[PDB]
Ligand binder design. Structure first.
Ligand SMILES: [Cu+2]
Lengths: 163, 163
């Protein structure tokens, strides 16, 4: 069925070969930034560290999956030790928790924490209201396809936007 | 619509009023231990500090999910800081991760960590072997129905045991 992995797989892609994101940054797997450096070798260097193997620049689904888990773990962990985020997160239902995790995964804990108002409405289950507000963000402006999916997940509490 | 929440709801129940678990400790929601004390007052008091109101020992589904989310947070967080658990955790696909969480929710991080040989089989993705091994545990012997569900989840990587 549906889960944070399938959801993020859809939003971030899944690639077994190093590629440039939309800032030209080297990335692999499911939206995993290797480095800002423009050097391809620095990128494979960081890759080999992360995977534990001389990969040249290609990995396996399994390696991409393990990588992904470590990244999600880091998003979740960041939510748990952030006192702005943990209470909204825990107030949420299972489907909407995945939405929040998505945001932290994309822009990081500190950033998602910057959404003070939306976070309130969400914790207060002001669903429609939250969706409207989030839509005005710079986040939506920069990645509207992805944002509307996340946003609509917040409104409905279903996986409708990924099915 | 299947997730860790639906999974543990089934395994542990979802109760909206305080009740005694096996061992007669006061409990609510999804196997949420309130207090070991024999006073129903003490149980209500703890309950009111957790939810944010005077409940009289009755909560809503949302509220019970809030509580469930806090217990789940604790399980994963515990896994994240456990050298014996995190690497197996990260080797697992999402469905299988919920199975591991399930186990930690039931018996505790330290307990699950005891399954040294079964975890290794899990990590190495030796599913049939892991399943065969886990069945020979005391856990299986004590709660064979729930355990077989969890075990079958590890064996297949699907939700079929809960449908
Ligand atoms: Cu921690």
């Amino acid at each position: 069925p549906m889960n944070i992995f399938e959801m993020l797989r859809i939003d971030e892609g899944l690639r077994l070969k190093i590629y440039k994101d939309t800032e030209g940054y080297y990335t692999i797997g499911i939206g995993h930034l290797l480095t800002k450096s423009p050097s391809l070798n620095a990128a494979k260097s960081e890759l080999d560290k992360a995977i534990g193997r001389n990969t040249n620049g290609v990995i396996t689904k399994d390696e991409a999956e393990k990588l992904f888990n470590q990244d999600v773990d880091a998003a979740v962990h960041g939510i748990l030790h952030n006192a702005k985020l943990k209470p909204v997160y825990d107030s949420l239902d299972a489907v909407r928790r995945a939405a929040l995790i998505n945001m932290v995964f994309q822009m990081g804990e500190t950033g998602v924490a910057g959404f003070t108002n939306s976070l309130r409405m969400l914790q207060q289950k002001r669903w429609d209201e939250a969706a409207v507000n989030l839509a005005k963000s710079r986040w939506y402006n920069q990645t509207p396809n992805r944002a509307k999916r996340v946003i609509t997940t917040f409104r409905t509490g279903t996986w409708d936007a990924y099915k």
